Amino acid sequence: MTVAYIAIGSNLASPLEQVNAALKALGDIPESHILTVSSFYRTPPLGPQDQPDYLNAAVALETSLAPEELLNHTQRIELQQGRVRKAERWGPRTLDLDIMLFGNEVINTERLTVPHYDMKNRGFMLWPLFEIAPELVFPDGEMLRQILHTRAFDKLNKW
Numbered sequence: 001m002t003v004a005y006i007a008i009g010s011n012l013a014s015p016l017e018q019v020n021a022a023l024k025a026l027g028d029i030p031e032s033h034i035l036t037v038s039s040f041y042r043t044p045p046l047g048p049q050d051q052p053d054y055l056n057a058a059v060a061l062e063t064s065l066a067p068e069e070l071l072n073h074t075q076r077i078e079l080q081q082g083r084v085r086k087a088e089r090w091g092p093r094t095l096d097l098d099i100m101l102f103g104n105e106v107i108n109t110e111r112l113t114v115p116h117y118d119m120k121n122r123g124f125m126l127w128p129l130f131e132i133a134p135e136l137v138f139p140d141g142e143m144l145r146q147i148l149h150t151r152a153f154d155k156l157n158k159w
């Protein structure tokens with residue numbers, strides 16, 4: 001099995017309820033087990049700012065699924081939690097499940113790019129990741145602890 005790390009976000013339809021429901025759904029993904037759940041953080045919106053604050057979190061999920069198979073399940077869960085596509089880039093959503101990392105794999109398919117392209121620039125991804133995996137090393141050898149020591153990210157507040 002491989003340890004995948006999934007970023008969770010919600011800013012619509014009661015984010016705490018959406019995230020708790022998503023965690024239960026993540027538990028039902030086949031060939032997979034949740035290892036660790038982060039704290040929940042209240043985060044200002046990235047992109048357009050005319051939307052509610054997000055609940056952001058992270059989960060470690062060990063799995064024997066193929067990377068795109070895991071994506072099939074995360075997309076399914078988003079859709080089943082009423083996620084509807086709107087035109088607005090980075091606009092509000094009931095649930096976002098991004099695959100941040102899939103072990104040490106570097107994946108570039110039509111549907112999937114891992115590591116997540118912007119995660120090293122987002123405190124709302126890196127802080128919950130550090131909470132659950134403080135010893136993490138990226139596929140390029142960069143240490144999570146070193147990024148968080150060196151780069152300025154705003155303080156992240158718990159939900």
Ligand SMILES: Nc1ncnc2c1ncn2[C@@H]1O[C@H](COP(=O)(O)CP(=O)(O)OP(=O)(O)O)[C@@H](O)[C@H]1O
Binds near residue numbers: 090099112113
């Ligand atoms: N690592 C990854 N995790 C989840 N989806 C990914 C992905 N890499 C590529 N994708 C693709 O990204 C597509 C669009 O997803 P969106 O949720 O609309 C982007 P977003 O999460 O709002 O922005 P962001 O990636 O800047 O955080 C999905 O349909 C999926 O095919």
Ligand SMILES: Nc1nc2[nH]cnc2c(=S)[nH]1
Binds near residue numbers: 008044047056124
């Ligand atoms: N804080 C935050 N802002 C966003 N804008 C679009 N998606 C997001 C998520 S998931 N979190």
Ligand SMILES: [Ca+2]
Binds near residue numbers: 030
């Ligand atoms: Ca399972």
Ligand SMILES: [Ca+2]
Binds near residue numbers: 009096098
């Ligand atoms: Ca996202």
Ligand SMILES: [Ca+2]
Binds near residue numbers: 097
């Ligand atoms: Ca997404």
